[PDB]
Amino acid sequence: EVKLVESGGGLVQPGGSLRLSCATSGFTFTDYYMSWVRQPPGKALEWLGFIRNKAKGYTVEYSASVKGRFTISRDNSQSILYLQMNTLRAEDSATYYCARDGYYVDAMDYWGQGTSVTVSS
Amino acid sequence: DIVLTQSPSSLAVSAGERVTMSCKSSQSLFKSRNQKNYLAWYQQKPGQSPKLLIYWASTRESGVPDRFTGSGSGTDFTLTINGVQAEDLAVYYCKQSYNLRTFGGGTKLELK
């Protein structure tokens, strides 16, 4: 059974940083991309970026709204995903989803249940 | 900045009625090589994680009911729910994967 598991989220002081975990199982991790999608309360889903598969050498891409702030990398030995957030605003206060991704379907086929991050003093 | 614009913002049908929803793109998500459109529809029940419904504009993701029909190509796409189920109460996102990924704003489906 495919499983995605986000964690590490809590409350963060503004200007600060938190690291997110994505743990998976039930498929061959390295063949797929992994994306991070977030959602602020009552707003739309916003893609943040992805990290490519083995074929692509596990390279990285981001959206313009977090490029330079956020950092994606992967634990292929453990099939774990990570997101490094920095210089955090309340506009980063949200639920963070890791999603299986790639060029097979060019869509995000499996998601976790998410993690909440709340930025506040 | 490829931008997908979803209308309506929301809509409220009864169970069994026939719902359609549109997705206008900034740019033609039509890839010439493989001759497909790079669009996908997701379902997000309230308080839950998203869930892929349809990719390449019209292909139903495994397990997805005949009800859900994706249609369109280029910069125009739609989602039809033939005979709505109570199960269907959610927000529906389109998302372009032509260049990186970009989520639409969503259509909030109500059920009377």
Ligand SMILES: O=C(O)[C@@]1(O)C[C@@H](O)[C@@H](O)[C@@H]([C@H](O)CO)O1
């Ligand atoms: O960036 C990618 O590796 C990827 O292959 C992902 C695909 O889903 C698609 O976005 C593709 C672009 O269409 C470029 O061909 O890029």
Ligand SMILES: [Mg+2]
């Ligand atoms: Mg599949």
Ligand SMILES: [Mg+2]
């Ligand atoms: Mg029924």
